[PDB]
Amino acid sequence: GTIITVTAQANEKNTRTVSTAKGDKKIISVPLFEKEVKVAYGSAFMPDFIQMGDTVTVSGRVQAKNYNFVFPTVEKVFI
Amino acid sequence: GTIITVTAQANEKNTRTVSTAKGDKKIISVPLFEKEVKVAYGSAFMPDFIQMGDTVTVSGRVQAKNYNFVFPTVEKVFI
């Protein structure tokens, strides 16, 4: 299988809060690779405890249709 | 940063041996994500000890131009 793991700061540039059937959720959009050609971005739902300005690690399978993480693990990173 | 980690069997379908300035190298081509839309594939050089039929974990940054792993870690997996 394939696992993509991204570490990024959740901020105004890459994170939005949306209404869902499960209430307010943050959704982050992160680059799936680098360049020296446009970079593809994957989206993942954040757990409720995550706050704007947190650094997080998003890890899991990604599905392409648009790129979405599937059953991601999201961890808060501390500095 | 972004790290892509793939576990796959090195076989006739996804691995070739090529001449390089550093002698014979195996190069594996692995899918960077899944689908239900074509899947992008990344390539990585295998360490010399890897053999056809081995299962390996390839982990590292990937660069798009074509997708190549950058300074990948390659580990043999045992069953």
mmCIF file of N, CA and C in Angstrom, chain A:
data_model
loop_
_atom_site.group_PDB
_atom_site.id
_atom_site.type_symbol
_atom_site.label_atom_id
_atom_site.label_comp_id
_atom_site.label_asym_id
_atom_site.label_seq_id
_atom_site.Cartn_x
_atom_site.Cartn_y
_atom_site.Cartn_z
ATOM 1 N N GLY A 1 0.836 -1.220 0.000
ATOM 2 C CA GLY A 1 0.000 0.000 0.000
ATOM 3 C C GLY A 1 0.858 1.251 0.000
ATOM 4 N N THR A 2 0.199 2.402 -0.131
ATOM 5 C CA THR A 2 0.862 3.704 -0.122
ATOM 6 C C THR A 2 0.324 4.590 0.998
ATOM 7 N N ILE A 3 1.262 5.160 1.759
ATOM 8 C CA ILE A 3 0.956 6.050 2.884
ATOM 9 C C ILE A 3 1.651 7.368 2.588
ATOM 10 N N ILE A 4 0.899 8.461 2.636
ATOM 11 C CA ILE A 4 1.485 9.790 2.487
ATOM 12 C C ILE A 4 1.425 10.450 3.856
ATOM 13 N N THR A 5 2.568 11.010 4.263
ATOM 14 C CA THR A 5 2.717 11.653 5.573
ATOM 15 C C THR A 5 3.173 13.095 5.401
ATOM 16 N N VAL A 6 2.329 14.051 5.789
ATOM 17 C CA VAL A 6 2.688 15.468 5.665
ATOM 18 C C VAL A 6 2.682 16.161 7.022
ATOM 19 N N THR A 7 3.705 16.972 7.266
ATOM 20 C CA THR A 7 3.780 17.812 8.451
ATOM 21 C C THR A 7 3.640 19.251 7.980
ATOM 22 N N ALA A 8 2.699 19.971 8.578
ATOM 23 C CA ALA A 8 2.381 21.319 8.126
ATOM 24 C C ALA A 8 1.691 22.102 9.246
ATOM 25 N N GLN A 9 1.756 23.430 9.172
ATOM 26 C CA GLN A 9 1.019 24.274 10.100
ATOM 27 C C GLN A 9 -0.386 24.504 9.559
ATOM 28 N N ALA A 10 -1.386 24.311 10.408
ATOM 29 C CA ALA A 10 -2.769 24.601 10.030
ATOM 30 C C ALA A 10 -3.017 26.099 10.159
ATOM 31 N N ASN A 11 -3.178 26.773 9.031
ATOM 32 C CA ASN A 11 -3.338 28.219 9.063
ATOM 33 C C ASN A 11 -4.345 28.713 8.038
ATOM 34 N N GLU A 12 -4.471 30.026 7.953
ATOM 35 C CA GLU A 12 -5.491 30.655 7.127
ATOM 36 C C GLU A 12 -5.296 30.327 5.633
ATOM 37 N N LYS A 13 -4.056 30.040 5.241
ATOM 38 C CA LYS A 13 -3.717 29.698 3.853
ATOM 39 C C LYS A 13 -4.093 28.283 3.419
ATOM 40 N N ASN A 14 -4.179 27.349 4.357
ATOM 41 C CA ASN A 14 -4.390 25.952 3.971
ATOM 42 C C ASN A 14 -5.539 25.225 4.689
ATOM 43 N N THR A 15 -6.222 25.924 5.599
ATOM 44 C CA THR A 15 -7.266 25.315 6.431
ATOM 45 C C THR A 15 -8.563 26.128 6.394
ATOM 46 N N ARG A 16 -9.695 25.436 6.255
ATOM 47 C CA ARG A 16 -11.030 26.066 6.316
ATOM 48 C C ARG A 16 -11.917 25.307 7.290
ATOM 49 N N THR A 17 -12.866 26.006 7.905
ATOM 50 C CA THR A 17 -13.882 25.355 8.734
ATOM 51 C C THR A 17 -15.183 25.303 7.963
ATOM 52 N N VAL A 18 -15.730 24.100 7.838
ATOM 53 C CA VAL A 18 -16.942 23.843 7.054
ATOM 54 C C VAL A 18 -18.002 23.161 7.908
ATOM 55 N N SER A 19 -19.266 23.328 7.539
ATOM 56 C CA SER A 19 -20.311 22.564 8.164
ATOM 57 C C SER A 19 -20.317 21.172 7.533
ATOM 58 N N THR A 20 -20.513 20.141 8.354
ATOM 59 C CA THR A 20 -20.678 18.767 7.870
ATOM 60 C C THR A 20 -21.823 18.155 8.656
ATOM 61 N N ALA A 21 -22.252 16.973 8.230
ATOM 62 C CA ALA A 21 -23.253 16.180 8.946
ATOM 63 C C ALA A 21 -22.799 15.808 10.373
ATOM 64 N N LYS A 22 -21.504 15.965 10.640
ATOM 65 C CA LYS A 22 -20.929 15.741 11.972
ATOM 66 C C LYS A 22 -20.537 17.064 12.653
ATOM 67 N N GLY A 23 -21.173 18.168 12.251
ATOM 68 C CA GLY A 23 -20.870 19.494 12.809
ATOM 69 C C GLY A 23 -19.666 20.152 12.162
ATOM 70 N N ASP A 24 -19.234 21.286 12.714
ATOM 71 C CA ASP A 24 -18.047 22.018 12.243
ATOM 72 C C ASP A 24 -16.825 21.095 12.140
ATOM 73 N N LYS A 25 -16.163 21.105 10.988
ATOM 74 C CA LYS A 25 -14.867 20.446 10.857
ATOM 75 C C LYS A 25 -13.901 21.347 10.155
ATOM 76 N N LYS A 26 -12.663 21.332 10.644
ATOM 77 C CA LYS A 26 -11.543 21.885 9.916
ATOM 78 C C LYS A 26 -11.134 20.912 8.820
ATOM 79 N N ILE A 27 -10.862 21.446 7.636
ATOM 80 C CA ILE A 27 -10.287 20.657 6.542
ATOM 81 C C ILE A 27 -8.989 21.330 6.106
ATOM 82 N N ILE A 28 -7.897 20.562 6.123
ATOM 83 C CA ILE A 28 -6.593 21.055 5.687
ATOM 84 C C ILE A 28 -6.289 20.549 4.276
ATOM 85 N N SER A 29 -5.577 21.364 3.506
ATOM 86 C CA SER A 29 -5.159 21.012 2.153
ATOM 87 C C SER A 29 -3.639 21.088 2.113
ATOM 88 N N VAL A 30 -3.000 19.949 1.859
ATOM 89 C CA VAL A 30 -1.524 19.839 1.906
ATOM 90 C C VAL A 30 -0.922 19.291 0.598
ATOM 91 N N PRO A 31 0.305 19.735 0.238
ATOM 92 C CA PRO A 31 0.953 19.269 -1.010
ATOM 93 C C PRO A 31 1.407 17.811 -0.871
ATOM 94 N N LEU A 32 1.110 17.009 -1.885
ATOM 95 C CA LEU A 32 1.474 15.596 -1.911
ATOM 96 C C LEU A 32 2.888 15.309 -2.406
ATOM 97 N N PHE A 33 3.551 16.323 -2.954
ATOM 98 C CA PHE A 33 4.949 16.213 -3.410
ATOM 99 C C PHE A 33 5.561 17.588 -3.674
ATOM 100 N N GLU A 34 6.858 17.625 -3.976
ATOM 101 C CA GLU A 34 7.561 18.877 -4.257
ATOM 102 C C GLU A 34 7.907 19.028 -5.748
ATOM 103 N N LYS A 35 8.393 20.218 -6.106
ATOM 104 C CA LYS A 35 8.858 20.541 -7.468
ATOM 105 C C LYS A 35 10.170 21.331 -7.399
ATOM 106 N N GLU A 36 10.807 21.550 -8.553
ATOM 107 C CA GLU A 36 12.018 22.381 -8.644
ATOM 108 C C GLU A 36 11.708 23.871 -8.516
ATOM 109 N N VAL A 37 4.969 23.071 -13.724
ATOM 110 C CA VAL A 37 4.694 21.803 -13.053
ATOM 111 C C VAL A 37 3.934 22.053 -11.750
ATOM 112 N N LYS A 38 2.631 21.782 -11.749
ATOM 113 C CA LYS A 38 1.812 22.087 -10.577
ATOM 114 C C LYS A 38 1.771 20.939 -9.565
ATOM 115 N N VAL A 39 1.845 21.289 -8.287
ATOM 116 C CA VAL A 39 1.819 20.303 -7.209
ATOM 117 C C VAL A 39 0.380 19.920 -6.851
ATOM 118 N N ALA A 40 0.114 18.619 -6.755
ATOM 119 C CA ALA A 40 -1.186 18.134 -6.312
ATOM 120 C C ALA A 40 -1.348 18.299 -4.785
ATOM 121 N N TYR A 41 -2.579 18.576 -4.350
ATOM 122 C CA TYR A 41 -2.903 18.805 -2.943
ATOM 123 C C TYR A 41 -3.918 17.805 -2.447
ATOM 124 N N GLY A 42 -3.696 17.302 -1.238
ATOM 125 C CA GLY A 42 -4.647 16.402 -0.608
ATOM 126 C C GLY A 42 -5.337 17.070 0.566
ATOM 127 N N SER A 43 -6.587 16.688 0.795
ATOM 128 C CA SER A 43 -7.370 17.230 1.902
ATOM 129 C C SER A 43 -7.646 16.186 2.972
ATOM 130 N N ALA A 44 -7.700 16.638 4.222
ATOM 131 C CA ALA A 44 -8.014 15.770 5.362
ATOM 132 C C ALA A 44 -8.801 16.531 6.432
ATOM 133 N N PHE A 45 -9.748 15.841 7.066
ATOM 134 C CA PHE A 45 -10.479 16.394 8.200
ATOM 135 C C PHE A 45 -9.611 16.347 9.448
ATOM 136 N N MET A 46 -9.640 17.422 10.227
ATOM 137 C CA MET A 46 -8.872 17.535 11.464
ATOM 138 C C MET A 46 -9.747 17.099 12.631
ATOM 139 N N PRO A 47 -9.140 16.442 13.643
ATOM 140 C CA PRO A 47 -9.841 16.170 14.905
ATOM 141 C C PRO A 47 -10.249 17.481 15.595
ATOM 142 N N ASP A 48 -11.262 17.420 16.457
ATOM 143 C CA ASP A 48 -11.838 18.627 17.069
ATOM 144 C C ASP A 48 -10.839 19.437 17.894
ATOM 145 N N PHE A 49 -9.849 18.783 18.501
ATOM 146 C CA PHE A 49 -8.922 19.497 19.397
ATOM 147 C C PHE A 49 -7.901 20.392 18.665
ATOM 148 N N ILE A 50 -7.678 20.127 17.377
ATOM 149 C CA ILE A 50 -6.754 20.915 16.572
ATOM 150 C C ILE A 50 -7.218 22.359 16.481
ATOM 151 N N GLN A 51 -6.275 23.289 16.633
ATOM 152 C CA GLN A 51 -6.540 24.728 16.567
ATOM 153 C C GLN A 51 -5.723 25.416 15.473
ATOM 154 N N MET A 52 -6.241 26.520 14.943
ATOM 155 C CA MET A 52 -5.492 27.331 13.987
ATOM 156 C C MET A 52 -4.137 27.695 14.586
ATOM 157 N N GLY A 53 -3.075 27.444 13.828
ATOM 158 C CA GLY A 53 -1.718 27.698 14.316
ATOM 159 C C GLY A 53 -0.993 26.460 14.806
ATOM 160 N N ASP A 54 -1.724 25.371 15.035
ATOM 161 C CA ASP A 54 -1.080 24.107 15.399
ATOM 162 C C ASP A 54 -0.266 23.557 14.231
ATOM 163 N N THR A 55 0.821 22.856 14.550
ATOM 164 C CA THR A 55 1.547 22.046 13.564
ATOM 165 C C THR A 55 1.014 20.624 13.730
ATOM 166 N N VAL A 56 0.704 19.976 12.599
ATOM 167 C CA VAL A 56 0.151 18.626 12.601
ATOM 168 C C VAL A 56 0.879 17.702 11.640
ATOM 169 N N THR A 57 0.817 16.411 11.941
ATOM 170 C CA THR A 57 1.249 15.384 11.015
ATOM 171 C C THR A 57 0.015 14.644 10.494
ATOM 172 N N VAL A 58 -0.214 14.729 9.189
ATOM 173 C CA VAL A 58 -1.288 13.968 8.544
ATOM 174 C C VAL A 58 -0.723 12.777 7.763
ATOM 175 N N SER A 59 -1.169 11.573 8.139
ATOM 176 C CA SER A 59 -0.652 10.341 7.570
ATOM 177 C C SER A 59 -1.760 9.356 7.190
ATOM 178 N N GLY A 60 -1.747 8.912 5.938
ATOM 179 C CA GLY A 60 -2.621 7.825 5.516
ATOM 180 C C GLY A 60 -2.655 7.652 4.020
ATOM 181 N N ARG A 61 -3.451 6.688 3.568
ATOM 182 C CA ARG A 61 -3.690 6.480 2.145
ATOM 183 C C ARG A 61 -4.311 7.742 1.575
ATOM 184 N N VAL A 62 -4.048 8.016 0.303
ATOM 185 C CA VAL A 62 -4.808 9.032 -0.410
ATOM 186 C C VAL A 62 -5.452 8.494 -1.683
ATOM 187 N N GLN A 63 -6.677 8.968 -1.920
ATOM 188 C CA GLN A 63 -7.528 8.579 -3.048
ATOM 189 C C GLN A 63 -7.696 9.723 -4.042
ATOM 190 N N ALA A 64 -7.538 9.435 -5.333
ATOM 191 C CA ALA A 64 -7.657 10.461 -6.372
ATOM 192 C C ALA A 64 -8.985 10.365 -7.130
ATOM 193 N N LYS A 65 -9.610 11.521 -7.395
ATOM 194 C CA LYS A 65 -10.846 11.630 -8.216
ATOM 195 C C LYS A 65 -10.690 12.630 -9.370
ATOM 196 N N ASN A 66 -9.034 15.711 -7.775
ATOM 197 C CA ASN A 66 -9.165 15.785 -6.321
ATOM 198 C C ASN A 66 -8.486 14.644 -5.549
ATOM 199 N N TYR A 67 -7.815 14.991 -4.454
ATOM 200 C CA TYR A 67 -7.088 14.015 -3.632
ATOM 201 C C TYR A 67 -7.528 14.083 -2.180
ATOM 202 N N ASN A 68 -8.051 12.977 -1.654
ATOM 203 C CA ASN A 68 -8.477 12.938 -0.251
ATOM 204 C C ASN A 68 -7.786 11.843 0.548
ATOM 205 N N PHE A 69 -7.377 12.161 1.777
ATOM 206 C CA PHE A 69 -6.826 11.163 2.694
ATOM 207 C C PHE A 69 -7.932 10.202 3.102
ATOM 208 N N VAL A 70 -7.593 8.921 3.268
ATOM 209 C CA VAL A 70 -8.553 7.892 3.683
ATOM 210 C C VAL A 70 -8.146 7.354 5.051
ATOM 211 N N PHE A 71 -9.078 7.369 6.008
ATOM 212 C CA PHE A 71 -8.798 7.054 7.422
ATOM 213 C C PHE A 71 -7.473 7.675 7.937
ATOM 214 N N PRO A 72 -7.241 8.993 7.725
ATOM 215 C CA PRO A 72 -5.937 9.523 8.158
ATOM 216 C C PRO A 72 -5.731 9.483 9.669
ATOM 217 N N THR A 73 -4.477 9.340 10.088
ATOM 218 C CA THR A 73 -4.077 9.635 11.453
ATOM 219 C C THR A 73 -3.634 11.087 11.432
ATOM 220 N N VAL A 74 -4.130 11.866 12.381
ATOM 221 C CA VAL A 74 -3.692 13.251 12.537
ATOM 222 C C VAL A 74 -3.136 13.409 13.949
ATOM 223 N N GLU A 75 -1.893 13.876 14.039
ATOM 224 C CA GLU A 75 -1.220 14.080 15.320
ATOM 225 C C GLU A 75 -0.797 15.524 15.437
ATOM 226 N N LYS A 76 -1.017 16.101 16.613
ATOM 227 C CA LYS A 76 -0.468 17.410 16.939
ATOM 228 C C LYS A 76 1.041 17.265 17.210
ATOM 229 N N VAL A 77 1.846 18.158 16.632
ATOM 230 C CA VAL A 77 3.305 18.192 16.832
ATOM 231 C C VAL A 77 3.676 19.328 17.776
ATOM 232 N N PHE A 78 4.570 19.060 18.722
ATOM 233 C CA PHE A 78 4.968 20.078 19.703
ATOM 234 C C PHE A 78 6.383 20.606 19.491
ATOM 235 N N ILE A 79 6.544 21.918 19.667
ATOM 236 C CA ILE A 79 7.842 22.602 19.555
ATOM 237 C C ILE A 79 8.232 23.258 20.878
#
